[PDB]
Amino acid sequence: TPVNAKFIITPVVIDATTGTDVTQSAEISFSKGNGTYEGTPELASESININAKYKGMTGSASVTIPALKAGQFGAKEVTIILSENFFAQEESSNSQIETTKHSGFKNNTSDYWYYITVTYTKKEGSEVIKNDYEGDDSEIKNIIDAYNKGVREDKVTLNDVQVLAHSRFSVFVDYMKTTSVYQIIEKSPDGNPVASFTVDSYNTIVSPKNEQIPGHGHAPSHGHGH
């Protein structure tokens, strides 16, 4: 039974009127699922819409879960802007691999699979790289700043990565850089775009690999068991 891919989406809700993270106080809804998405074992690329409500303000953002193969694990934060007067609309988004890291290989020539520990550095966060807004409206400024909290690094440890039997095992870590263009648009009962800004956002995908040992007489499998 293959290890399912997994992807976690973490909403962060910002009240633009004050610049405050209100995530723990806001009503939050996922269009589908509960924030944690698990393949069968593959996960299809899919768009999830996250809505939030706080003090009569509503806001929404979409996040694309990437297509993931067996064993791959990823996570991404998504910012939801709440404002009485504006909404932030993502106009375009393009993701690229910024860095690929790859361990050396552990050969498992035995007939038994087992769990290994994988400690990895999670690169995540967000920076505004372009901002065309020239005004003094603090609400607009708060919205833009919400995407400029910075890029950060954190060690994460999985103790449950599967090393198959008859397998050349290794781990990839990919740092993804996503460039997105947003407009800030007036709410109205229609609205004017009042600013445009561009964000580079970062997240990490981990990909344990169980490959053929060249010359070995078996392909990777669960063998005789654990």
Side-chain angles (χ1 to χ4, degrees), residues 1-52 54-68 70-105 107-121 123-154 156-158 160-226:
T1 288
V3 182
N4 299 333
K6 181 182 285 185
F7 196 85
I8 300 168
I9 293 162
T10 302
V12 179
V13 185
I14 303 303
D15 176 3
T17 61
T18 189
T20 293
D21 182 336
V22 299
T23 303
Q24 274 198 60
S25 306
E27 185 183 346
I28 300 176
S29 62
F30 295 85
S31 59
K32 282 183 165 71
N34 65 10
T36 299
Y37 300 84
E38 183 173 0
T40 61
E42 301 197 344
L43 200 52
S45 186
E46 165 179 35
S47 186
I48 305 302
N49 288 2
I50 300 99
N51 282 72
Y54 176 84
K55 292 185 167 176
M57 286 172 291
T58 65
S60 80
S62 296
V63 59
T64 294
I65 299 166
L68 292 183
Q72 293 191 285
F73 174 74
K76 210 187 316 215
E77 288 192 336
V78 59
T79 296
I80 304 106
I81 299 300
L82 294 180
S83 161
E84 217 79 56
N85 301 299
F86 307 102
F87 62 106
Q89 178 165 285
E90 195 176 2
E91 298 302 328
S92 72
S93 197
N94 178 83
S95 307
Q96 81 188 85
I97 295 157
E98 178 177 57
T99 302
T100 299
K101 305 200 326 209
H102 185 213
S103 69
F105 305 103
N107 281 338
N108 183 13
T109 53
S110 93
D111 228 306
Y112 303 82
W113 70 273
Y114 62 87
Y115 290 117
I116 201 166
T117 286
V118 178
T119 309
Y120 86 89
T121 314
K123 187 189 194 168
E124 175 102 52
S126 182
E127 47 170 10
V128 172
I129 67 176
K130 186 173 168 189
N131 173 14
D132 298 351
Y133 181 63
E134 302 291 7
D136 53 343
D137 185 337
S138 63
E139 202 185 348
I140 289 168
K141 294 183 295 190
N142 286 341
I143 295 175
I144 303 167
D145 291 345
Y147 294 89
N148 205 36
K149 295 189 180 285
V151 175
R152 70 210 196 247
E153 307 206 313
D154 288 79
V156 165
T157 304
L158 320 177
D160 62 303
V161 179
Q162 193 154 328
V163 179
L164 291 181
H166 304 287
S167 174
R168 179 182 205 75
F169 175 87
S170 64
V171 182
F172 292 85
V173 178
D174 289 82
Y175 297 164
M176 308 303 305
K177 180 175 90 161
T178 297
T179 308
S180 303
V181 170
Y182 294 83
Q183 289 191 311
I184 294 169
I185 304 167
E186 293 172 338
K187 294 204 170 202
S188 72
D190 186 285
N192 296 353
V194 299
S196 178
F197 64 101
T198 301
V199 183
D200 282 348
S201 58
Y202 298 86
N203 70 301
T204 303
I205 293 171
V206 182
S207 301
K209 294 291 195 201
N210 281 281
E211 295 176 342
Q212 181 67 45
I213 300 176
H216 197 60
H218 288 294
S221 68
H222 302 82
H224 301 162
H226 199 154

Short mmCIF file of all heavy atoms in Angstrom, two decimals, residues 140-184, unseen atoms left out:
data_model
loop_
_atom_site.label_atom_id
_atom_site.label_comp_id
_atom_site.label_asym_id
_atom_site.label_seq_id
_atom_site.Cartn_x
_atom_site.Cartn_y
_atom_site.Cartn_z
N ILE A 140 -4.73 50.39 2.27
CA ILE A 140 -4.07 49.88 1.07
C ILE A 140 -2.64 49.44 1.43
O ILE A 140 -2.19 48.33 1.07
CB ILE A 140 -4.06 50.90 -0.06
CG1 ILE A 140 -5.49 51.08 -0.61
CG2 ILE A 140 -3.09 50.44 -1.15
CD1 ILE A 140 -5.67 52.31 -1.55
N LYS A 141 -1.94 50.28 2.18
CA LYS A 141 -0.58 49.94 2.62
C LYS A 141 -0.55 48.66 3.46
O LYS A 141 0.37 47.84 3.31
CB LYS A 141 0.10 51.12 3.36
CG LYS A 141 0.34 52.32 2.42
CD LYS A 141 1.08 53.51 3.09
CE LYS A 141 0.27 54.15 4.19
NZ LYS A 141 0.88 55.47 4.70
N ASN A 142 -1.55 48.47 4.32
CA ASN A 142 -1.60 47.27 5.15
C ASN A 142 -1.76 45.98 4.34
O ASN A 142 -1.16 44.92 4.66
CB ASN A 142 -2.75 47.38 6.18
CG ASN A 142 -2.43 48.35 7.32
OD1 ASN A 142 -1.28 48.65 7.55
ND2 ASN A 142 -3.45 48.82 8.04
N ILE A 143 -2.61 46.08 3.31
CA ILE A 143 -2.82 44.99 2.38
C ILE A 143 -1.50 44.59 1.71
O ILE A 143 -1.12 43.40 1.65
CB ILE A 143 -3.90 45.38 1.32
CG1 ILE A 143 -5.26 45.56 1.98
CG2 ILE A 143 -4.04 44.25 0.28
CD1 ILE A 143 -6.43 46.06 1.07
N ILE A 144 -0.79 45.58 1.16
CA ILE A 144 0.48 45.27 0.51
C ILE A 144 1.49 44.68 1.48
O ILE A 144 2.13 43.68 1.17
CB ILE A 144 1.07 46.51 -0.26
CG1 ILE A 144 0.03 46.96 -1.28
CG2 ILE A 144 2.36 46.09 -0.98
CD1 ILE A 144 0.25 48.40 -1.97
N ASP A 145 1.59 45.25 2.68
CA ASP A 145 2.54 44.77 3.71
C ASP A 145 2.27 43.33 4.16
O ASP A 145 3.17 42.65 4.62
CB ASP A 145 2.50 45.69 4.95
CG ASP A 145 3.07 47.06 4.68
OD1 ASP A 145 3.76 47.24 3.64
OD2 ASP A 145 2.84 47.98 5.51
N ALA A 146 1.04 42.88 4.01
CA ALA A 146 0.62 41.57 4.43
C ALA A 146 1.33 40.51 3.61
O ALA A 146 1.52 39.40 4.10
CB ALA A 146 -0.90 41.43 4.30
N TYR A 147 1.74 40.87 2.39
CA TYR A 147 2.49 40.00 1.50
C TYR A 147 4.03 40.17 1.61
O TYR A 147 4.79 39.51 0.84
CB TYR A 147 2.04 40.24 0.04
CG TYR A 147 0.63 39.80 -0.20
CD1 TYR A 147 -0.40 40.68 0.01
CD2 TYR A 147 0.31 38.50 -0.56
CE1 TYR A 147 -1.67 40.31 -0.15
CE2 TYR A 147 -1.01 38.14 -0.77
CZ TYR A 147 -1.98 39.06 -0.55
OH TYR A 147 -3.32 38.77 -0.72
N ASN A 148 4.46 41.03 2.53
CA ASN A 148 5.87 41.37 2.69
C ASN A 148 6.40 41.01 4.05
O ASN A 148 7.23 41.73 4.56
CB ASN A 148 6.09 42.87 2.46
CG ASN A 148 7.50 43.18 2.02
OD1 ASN A 148 8.12 42.40 1.27
ND2 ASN A 148 8.04 44.26 2.52
N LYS A 149 5.96 39.89 4.63
CA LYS A 149 6.38 39.54 5.99
C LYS A 149 7.77 38.89 6.04
O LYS A 149 8.42 38.86 7.09
CB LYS A 149 5.32 38.66 6.66
CG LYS A 149 3.98 39.39 6.88
CD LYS A 149 2.99 38.60 7.73
CE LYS A 149 1.69 39.36 7.91
NZ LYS A 149 1.84 40.48 8.88
N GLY A 150 8.22 38.37 4.90
CA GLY A 150 9.60 37.97 4.75
C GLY A 150 9.68 36.49 4.51
O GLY A 150 8.68 35.81 4.53
N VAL A 151 10.89 36.01 4.29
CA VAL A 151 11.13 34.64 3.97
C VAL A 151 11.83 34.06 5.16
O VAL A 151 12.73 34.69 5.68
CB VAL A 151 12.01 34.54 2.74
CG1 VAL A 151 12.37 33.10 2.46
CG2 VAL A 151 11.30 35.14 1.60
N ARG A 152 11.42 32.89 5.60
CA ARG A 152 11.97 32.31 6.82
C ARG A 152 12.32 30.83 6.66
O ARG A 152 11.83 30.13 5.74
CB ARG A 152 10.98 32.54 7.96
CG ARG A 152 9.72 31.72 7.84
CD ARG A 152 8.50 32.38 8.46
NE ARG A 152 7.50 31.34 8.59
CZ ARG A 152 6.36 31.27 7.93
NH1 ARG A 152 5.98 32.23 7.07
NH2 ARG A 152 5.58 30.22 8.16
N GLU A 153 13.17 30.34 7.55
CA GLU A 153 13.62 28.94 7.50
C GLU A 153 13.45 28.24 8.84
O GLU A 153 13.61 28.86 9.91
CB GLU A 153 15.03 28.89 6.96
CG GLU A 153 15.09 29.65 5.63
CD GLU A 153 16.18 29.18 4.74
OE1 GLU A 153 17.29 29.02 5.26
OE2 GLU A 153 15.93 28.96 3.53
N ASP A 154 13.08 26.97 8.78
CA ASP A 154 12.68 26.20 9.95
C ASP A 154 13.02 24.73 9.69
O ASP A 154 12.74 24.20 8.61
CB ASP A 154 11.17 26.33 10.21
CG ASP A 154 10.76 27.72 10.75
OD1 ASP A 154 10.66 28.66 9.95
OD2 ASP A 154 10.49 27.84 11.97
N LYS A 155 13.62 24.05 10.67
CA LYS A 155 13.91 22.63 10.51
C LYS A 155 12.63 21.86 10.81
O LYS A 155 11.90 22.20 11.74
CB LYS A 155 15.09 22.19 11.40
CG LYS A 155 16.44 22.85 11.03
CD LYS A 155 17.65 21.97 11.35
CE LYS A 155 18.98 22.74 11.25
N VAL A 156 12.35 20.84 10.01
CA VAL A 156 11.16 20.00 10.16
C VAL A 156 11.71 18.60 10.14
O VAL A 156 12.71 18.34 9.47
CB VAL A 156 10.15 20.18 8.98
CG1 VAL A 156 9.13 19.05 8.97
CG2 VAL A 156 9.43 21.53 9.06
N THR A 157 11.09 17.70 10.91
CA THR A 157 11.58 16.34 11.03
C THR A 157 10.44 15.38 10.86
O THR A 157 9.49 15.40 11.64
CB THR A 157 12.22 16.09 12.40
OG1 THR A 157 13.26 17.05 12.63
CG2 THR A 157 12.81 14.68 12.46
N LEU A 158 10.55 14.55 9.81
CA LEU A 158 9.64 13.43 9.59
C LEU A 158 10.39 12.15 10.03
O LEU A 158 11.52 11.91 9.60
CB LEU A 158 9.18 13.41 8.13
CG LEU A 158 8.88 14.80 7.51
CD1 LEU A 158 8.49 14.75 6.03
CD2 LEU A 158 7.80 15.48 8.33
N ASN A 159 9.78 11.37 10.93
CA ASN A 159 10.33 10.09 11.42
C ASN A 159 9.66 8.87 10.76
O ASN A 159 9.85 7.73 11.19
CB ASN A 159 10.16 10.01 12.95
N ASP A 160 8.93 9.11 9.67
CA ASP A 160 8.03 8.13 9.06
C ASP A 160 8.21 8.03 7.51
O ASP A 160 7.28 7.72 6.78
CB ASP A 160 6.61 8.56 9.36
CG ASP A 160 6.30 9.90 8.75
OD1 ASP A 160 7.02 10.89 9.05
OD2 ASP A 160 5.35 9.97 7.95
N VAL A 161 9.41 8.31 7.03
CA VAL A 161 9.66 8.22 5.61
C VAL A 161 9.98 6.75 5.31
O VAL A 161 10.73 6.08 6.03
CB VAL A 161 10.77 9.17 5.21
CG1 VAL A 161 11.07 9.06 3.69
CG2 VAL A 161 10.37 10.60 5.60
N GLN A 162 9.39 6.25 4.26
CA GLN A 162 9.48 4.84 3.96
C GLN A 162 10.66 4.54 3.04
O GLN A 162 10.75 5.12 1.94
CB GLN A 162 8.17 4.44 3.32
CG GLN A 162 7.91 2.99 3.19
CD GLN A 162 6.42 2.71 3.16
OE1 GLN A 162 5.64 3.42 3.79
NE2 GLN A 162 6.02 1.68 2.43
N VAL A 163 11.56 3.67 3.51
CA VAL A 163 12.65 3.10 2.73
C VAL A 163 12.19 1.73 2.29
O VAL A 163 12.03 0.85 3.10
CB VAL A 163 13.97 2.94 3.53
CG1 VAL A 163 15.07 2.32 2.65
CG2 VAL A 163 14.42 4.27 4.10
N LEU A 164 11.94 1.55 1.00
CA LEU A 164 11.41 0.26 0.53
C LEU A 164 12.45 -0.82 0.53
O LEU A 164 13.64 -0.56 0.61
CB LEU A 164 10.77 0.40 -0.88
CG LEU A 164 9.47 1.20 -0.95
CD1 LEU A 164 8.93 1.23 -2.37
CD2 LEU A 164 8.42 0.61 -0.01
N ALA A 165 11.99 -2.06 0.44
CA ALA A 165 12.90 -3.17 0.18
C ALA A 165 13.44 -3.04 -1.24
O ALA A 165 12.78 -2.47 -2.14
CB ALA A 165 12.22 -4.51 0.41
N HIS A 166 14.65 -3.54 -1.45
CA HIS A 166 15.27 -3.63 -2.79
C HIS A 166 15.24 -2.28 -3.48
O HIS A 166 14.74 -2.14 -4.61
CB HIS A 166 14.57 -4.70 -3.63
CG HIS A 166 14.56 -6.06 -3.00
ND1 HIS A 166 15.68 -6.85 -2.90
CD2 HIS A 166 13.56 -6.77 -2.42
CE1 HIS A 166 15.38 -7.99 -2.30
NE2 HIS A 166 14.09 -7.97 -2.00
N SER A 167 15.72 -1.27 -2.76
CA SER A 167 15.55 0.13 -3.18
C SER A 167 16.80 0.96 -3.00
O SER A 167 17.53 0.79 -2.02
CB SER A 167 14.42 0.79 -2.37
OG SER A 167 14.35 2.17 -2.68
N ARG A 168 17.05 1.82 -3.97
CA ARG A 168 18.05 2.87 -3.89
C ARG A 168 17.27 4.09 -3.42
O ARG A 168 16.45 4.65 -4.17
CB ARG A 168 18.68 3.10 -5.27
CG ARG A 168 19.71 4.18 -5.32
CD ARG A 168 20.23 4.35 -6.74
NE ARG A 168 21.56 4.92 -6.72
CZ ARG A 168 22.67 4.26 -6.40
NH1 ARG A 168 22.64 2.96 -6.06
NH2 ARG A 168 23.84 4.91 -6.40
N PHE A 169 17.49 4.45 -2.17
CA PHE A 169 16.71 5.48 -1.50
C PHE A 169 17.48 6.76 -1.36
O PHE A 169 18.66 6.76 -1.01
CB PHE A 169 16.28 4.96 -0.11
CG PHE A 169 15.55 5.99 0.73
CD1 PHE A 169 14.19 6.16 0.62
CD2 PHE A 169 16.26 6.83 1.60
CE1 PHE A 169 13.52 7.17 1.37
CE2 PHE A 169 15.61 7.79 2.37
CZ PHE A 169 14.23 7.97 2.24
N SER A 170 16.79 7.88 -1.55
CA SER A 170 17.31 9.20 -1.37
C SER A 170 16.16 10.19 -1.16
O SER A 170 14.99 9.84 -1.31
CB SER A 170 18.17 9.64 -2.57
OG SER A 170 17.40 9.73 -3.76
N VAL A 171 16.52 11.42 -0.82
CA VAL A 171 15.48 12.43 -0.63
C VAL A 171 15.83 13.68 -1.43
O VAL A 171 16.91 14.18 -1.34
CB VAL A 171 15.31 12.76 0.87
CG1 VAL A 171 14.19 13.80 1.06
CG2 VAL A 171 15.02 11.49 1.66
N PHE A 172 14.85 14.20 -2.16
CA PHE A 172 14.90 15.55 -2.73
C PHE A 172 14.11 16.55 -1.89
O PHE A 172 13.08 16.22 -1.32
CB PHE A 172 14.36 15.60 -4.17
CG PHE A 172 15.20 14.89 -5.17
CD1 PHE A 172 15.07 13.52 -5.38
CD2 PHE A 172 16.05 15.61 -5.98
CE1 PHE A 172 15.85 12.87 -6.38
CE2 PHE A 172 16.84 14.97 -6.93
CZ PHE A 172 16.72 13.59 -7.11
N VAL A 173 14.64 17.76 -1.79
CA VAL A 173 13.93 18.90 -1.25
C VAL A 173 13.95 19.98 -2.32
O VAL A 173 15.02 20.41 -2.77
CB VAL A 173 14.57 19.40 0.05
CG1 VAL A 173 13.83 20.64 0.57
CG2 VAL A 173 14.59 18.27 1.09
N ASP A 174 12.76 20.45 -2.74
CA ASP A 174 12.67 21.49 -3.71
C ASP A 174 12.11 22.74 -3.08
O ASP A 174 11.06 22.67 -2.48
CB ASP A 174 11.79 21.07 -4.87
CG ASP A 174 12.45 20.00 -5.75
OD1 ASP A 174 12.37 18.82 -5.39
OD2 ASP A 174 13.03 20.33 -6.79
N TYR A 175 12.79 23.86 -3.26
CA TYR A 175 12.30 25.16 -2.92
C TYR A 175 11.67 25.76 -4.14
O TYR A 175 12.30 25.91 -5.15
CB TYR A 175 13.44 26.07 -2.44
CG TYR A 175 14.15 25.65 -1.19
CD1 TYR A 175 15.39 26.21 -0.87
CD2 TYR A 175 13.59 24.77 -0.29
CE1 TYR A 175 16.04 25.86 0.28
CE2 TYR A 175 14.24 24.42 0.85
CZ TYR A 175 15.45 24.94 1.13
OH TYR A 175 16.07 24.57 2.31
N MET A 176 10.40 26.10 -4.01
CA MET A 176 9.56 26.64 -5.05
C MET A 176 9.45 28.18 -4.83
O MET A 176 9.29 28.63 -3.67
CB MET A 176 8.15 26.03 -4.92
CG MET A 176 8.07 24.48 -4.83
SD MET A 176 8.92 23.68 -6.37
CE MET A 176 7.96 24.56 -7.77
N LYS A 177 9.64 28.94 -5.90
CA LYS A 177 9.48 30.39 -5.92
C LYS A 177 8.30 30.71 -6.82
O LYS A 177 8.31 30.34 -7.98
CB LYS A 177 10.72 31.09 -6.46
CG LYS A 177 10.56 32.63 -6.48
CD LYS A 177 11.81 33.34 -6.89
CE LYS A 177 11.89 33.54 -8.37
NZ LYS A 177 12.90 34.62 -8.68
N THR A 178 7.25 31.31 -6.26
CA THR A 178 6.06 31.59 -7.00
C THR A 178 5.99 33.15 -7.13
O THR A 178 6.04 33.84 -6.13
CB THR A 178 4.83 31.03 -6.32
OG1 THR A 178 4.86 29.59 -6.24
CG2 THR A 178 3.55 31.46 -7.03
N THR A 179 5.91 33.66 -8.35
CA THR A 179 5.76 35.09 -8.63
C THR A 179 4.29 35.35 -9.02
O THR A 179 3.78 34.76 -9.98
CB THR A 179 6.70 35.59 -9.75
OG1 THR A 179 8.06 35.18 -9.42
CG2 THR A 179 6.63 37.20 -9.91
N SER A 180 3.63 36.19 -8.23
CA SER A 180 2.21 36.49 -8.38
C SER A 180 1.97 37.99 -8.45
O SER A 180 2.56 38.75 -7.69
CB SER A 180 1.44 35.88 -7.21
OG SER A 180 1.63 34.46 -7.10
N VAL A 181 1.06 38.40 -9.31
CA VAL A 181 0.71 39.80 -9.50
C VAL A 181 -0.70 39.94 -8.96
O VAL A 181 -1.57 39.14 -9.30
CB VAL A 181 0.73 40.21 -11.00
CG1 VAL A 181 0.13 41.62 -11.20
CG2 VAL A 181 2.16 40.05 -11.61
N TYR A 182 -0.89 40.93 -8.09
CA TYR A 182 -2.16 41.22 -7.47
C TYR A 182 -2.61 42.62 -7.84
O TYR A 182 -1.80 43.55 -7.95
CB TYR A 182 -2.06 41.18 -5.93
CG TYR A 182 -1.77 39.83 -5.33
CD1 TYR A 182 -0.47 39.36 -5.24
CD2 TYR A 182 -2.80 38.95 -4.95
CE1 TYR A 182 -0.21 38.10 -4.71
CE2 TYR A 182 -2.51 37.69 -4.44
CZ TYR A 182 -1.22 37.29 -4.33
OH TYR A 182 -0.93 36.02 -3.84
N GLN A 183 -3.93 42.80 -7.95
CA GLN A 183 -4.51 44.14 -7.91
C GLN A 183 -5.34 44.29 -6.64
O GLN A 183 -6.01 43.32 -6.16
CB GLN A 183 -5.43 44.39 -9.10
CG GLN A 183 -4.72 44.54 -10.41
CD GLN A 183 -5.68 45.05 -11.47
OE1 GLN A 183 -6.76 44.52 -11.62
NE2 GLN A 183 -5.30 46.09 -12.16
N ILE A 184 -5.30 45.49 -6.11
CA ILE A 184 -6.17 45.87 -5.02
C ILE A 184 -7.34 46.59 -5.68
O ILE A 184 -7.13 47.53 -6.44
CB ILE A 184 -5.47 46.75 -4.01
CG1 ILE A 184 -4.37 45.91 -3.33
CG2 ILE A 184 -6.51 47.29 -2.99
CD1 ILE A 184 -3.41 46.67 -2.50
#
